[PDB]
Design a protein around this ligand. Structure first.
Ligand code: HEM
Ligand code: HEM
Ligand code: HEM
Ligand code: HEM
Lengths: 146, 146, 146, 146
């Protein structure tokens, strides 16, 4: 893969406008609602039997903040996402056994959340740059499986 | 599959607020820009060499409207989508050789467009209902392949 | 979907030459080794820390037999697989939260086992018929999710 | 990703036993039969309306030889598949617009062909190493899309 100058500017600029205290909870909660099977990894977070219980769960909100903060840090290292996520790859693959397909699923739900918050600013080109980011993150986090 | 009565209500209600004349071209054009390989099915549609050419292309806008008007008719048959799409399955599978993976891709681009147009109104539960609709439509259209 | 009379004949004839007592453990064990993340669904099955432990594990062999005996019964109902697998869909979706992508994965590991056991006899046309069967079984088992 | 010493030895040793004058035609032909949509890229090869016509087509056999010869060369460069396939990535993505999902589809059909020819020698571990190879090749060839 390869980010263009335009890709980097679009990723960096849009991300600077995200609130990583609500976006993270919103993204992980939406993943858990829309694709229910993912709840299996988070049986320690409490009751996730309904949308309201998930979107209102403080451990979901707290953990989504970690997720997006680590992604925000990675956006400082676009040309080296493999190395930047090496340690989290080890955690997610070797220790938690998260299905590699889930990384792209979460990335697509972040794209949905960006489209909700930014609307018409999320043009096809802007979405293309973010789809490249989703793919790249998923590859970096599944590296230990490959 | 199975649509709950709440899935049907969501699907029909949100669709009634969709302007097909705008959403059609916006959905097909977004698919062509974001996932460029799909342009190979539309060589006769003329200039697709840049995002601005795709989003300005009269044939892309006219075709997207056909697509979304076909999906509007399908929403009147939610609990018989395979029978509803039998003719278009034959067209897309036996005659055009569309990759079944692309039906899922276009339905995901429509989810993105709905998120852009409705923002917050596109809640996690509303997205779940539409995610089941995209899957159901993909399955119905690739039925000739199965 | 749709099974041709030649798909049914292929499926039933090749299956009649399959030894389930061997193929069962061989298929589940291959899935656990090749796609290690799926081991997380089988923590109670004991030692799955190495390929030799998985392929020697008595619980994996006993479970694989259940799996393949379930698929043998399904082959007697090829043109009603969704109804046939309704109970196991509820089990795998509502109770175990299996990722629908893993049903496709296991059916692909079975294709590999059939290729190993039958060699040349597993022609391109015979594989096509079995590829439709894996897809049909995945769709039927993930039906609760749709 | 990362090949282990064991991965490299397994890939290199099994590949040294493949016949790249028949395996290539067998792999591309099987892809065209099993997953019909792929035939769309090869409308220049002649009649592909049936298994017999595909498996007997001299242009299929001739082109599959190219495919596997380029893969054989890549197996000399396991630690640098991105650079080794850079030029073919440009051809397949920028010029032919091949769907990225097809690269993994072809890789899985090569795995089926290896299982047919090598049988019990294709153990779960041996298949794991080859699945890692399939993923890595698909990533290298789709790089221009990412
Ligand atoms: C954008 C991709 C993702 C990133 C950046 C990410 C990041 C993180 C981080 C930073 C942690 C915390 C580790 C610590 O606290 O030391 C974590 C834990 C975890 N992640 Fe992820 N993650 C990602 C995707 C996923 C996906 C797709 C899954 C499964 C669907 C997943 C499941 C988990 C689990 C089960 C934990 C342990 C949490 C606990 O102990 O309660 N993650 N992740
Ligand atoms: C939401 C899924 C889809 C639906 C509901 C849909 C619906 C339609 C309909 C109704 C037509 C007929 C147009 C007319 O009568 O002139 C059509 C034509 C076509 N569709 Fe789709 N389609 C879908 C997905 C796809 C995808 C994923 C592709 C491939 C990237 C595709 C490629 C085509 C092509 C090439 C035509 C013929 C266009 C022309 O040259 O006239 N469709 N589709
Ligand atoms: C070819 C697709 C599959 C079929 C036909 C199938 C069939 C079965 C059947 C018949 C049982 C019941 C066993 C008994 O009565 O004791 C079962 C249990 C189960 N299956 Fe599947 N299954 C399939 C795919 C999967 C996949 C992809 C996974 C996840 C990696 C999975 C995870 C499980 C689990 C965790 C159990 C419960 C086992 C235990 O703890 O007792 N299955 N399956
Ligand atoms: C293991 C992965 C693959 C490799 C190593 C590979 C390699 C090659 C090579 C060496 C060529 C010849 C270029 C030349 O003659 O200068 C080629 C051409 C081509 N490939 Fe691939 N390929 C791969 C996968 C694919 C897939 C998945 C598709 C689509 C399903 C595809 C479609 C094509 C087409 C359409 C051509 C042009 C052939 C013609 O002009 O008639 N390839 N490939």
């Amino acid at each position: 893969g390869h980010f263009t100058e335009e890709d980097k500017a679009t990723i960096t600029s849009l991300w600077g406008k995200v609130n990583v205290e609500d976006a993270g909870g919103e993204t992980l909660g939406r993943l858990l609602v829309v694709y229910p099977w993912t709840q299996r990894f988070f049986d320690s977070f409490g009751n996730l039997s309904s949308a309201s219980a998930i979107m209102g769960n403080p451990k979901v909100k707290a953990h989504g903040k970690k997720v997006l903060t680590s992604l925000g840090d990675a956006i400082k290292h676009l040309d080296d996402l493999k190395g930047t996520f090496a340690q989290l790859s080890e955690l997610h693959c070797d220790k938690l056994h998260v299905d590699p397909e889930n990384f792209k699923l979460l990335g697509n739900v972040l794209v949905t959340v960006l489209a909700i918050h930014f609307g018409k600013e999320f043009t096809p080109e802007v979405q293309a740059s973010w789809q490249k980011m989703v793919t790249a993150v998923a590859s970096a986090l599944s590296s230990r499986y490959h």
